Symmetry: none
Subunit: 135 residues, 2 copies
């Protein structure tokens, strides 16, 4: 039961800093991508520092695909919030794009080619999960 050595991260994940990262298998709407990470006892990507940003941009340099992050905005009236209920801080980046009240279930942000964008949560895209590294 108590770990013989215990790896920082599970197999197929990527270890960097105090975190483990897992790249989605395919395209799913935001709500589902969220369910996928929660089921693994993790969460959607939350960039909380420059090092995280550097790592992700590099780990996603090989792709042109959109990767959902755990950031959403119910509608224009509301603010951009991460999954843990905390606000979006300025310094890191800006989410360009539309926040439409016609969108069925709010607006969600994704990362693609280094820049962050806004989109109808209902659409499908790849995602990135994250958990603290086992140390």
């Amino acid at each position: 039961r108590v770990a013989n050595c215990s790896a920082p991260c599970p197999q197929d994940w990527i270890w960097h800093g105090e975190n483990c990262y897992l790249f989605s298998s395919g395209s799913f709407n935001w709500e589902k991508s969220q369910e996928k990470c929660l089921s693994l006892d993790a969460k959607l990507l939350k960039i909380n520092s420059t090092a995280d940003l550097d790592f992700i941009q590099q780990a996603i340099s090989y792709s042109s695909f959109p990767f959902w992050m755990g950031l959403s905005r119910r509608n224009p009236s509301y603010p951009w919030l991460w999954e843990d209920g905390s606000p979006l801080m300025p310094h890191l980046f800006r989410v360009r794009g539309a926040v439409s009240q016609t969108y069925p279930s709010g607006t969600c942000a994704y990362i693609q080619r280094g820049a962050v964008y806004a989109e109808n949560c209902i659409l499908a895209a790849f995602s990135i999960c994250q958990k603290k590294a086992n140390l």
Copy 2:
């Protein structure tokens, strides 16, 4: 004692790494050795599946440790072992002779034959500390 270093992908008995630059087969092999690794070697259908998963989101060609001098030589990995019969089927330029031989790479889930002289990204692998 961590299985693999940061940025590597721990899967089964090994660690895996996507290269930072696009080079010819020779230079790519040099780069993997420099990292105490070798070019990717697929020992089964499970290896291949894991690879495609990791490369799903990319349309780039990734060199692997498979090659031969010309169509008269069979496909062999760097270590000398042959290509297992039922793993995959190498497509593309399989009937040509290149001064620097024909090398293989994975792109879009499929394996192709190409002039070793050409550029491509690569996948390096090494044993994990278990």
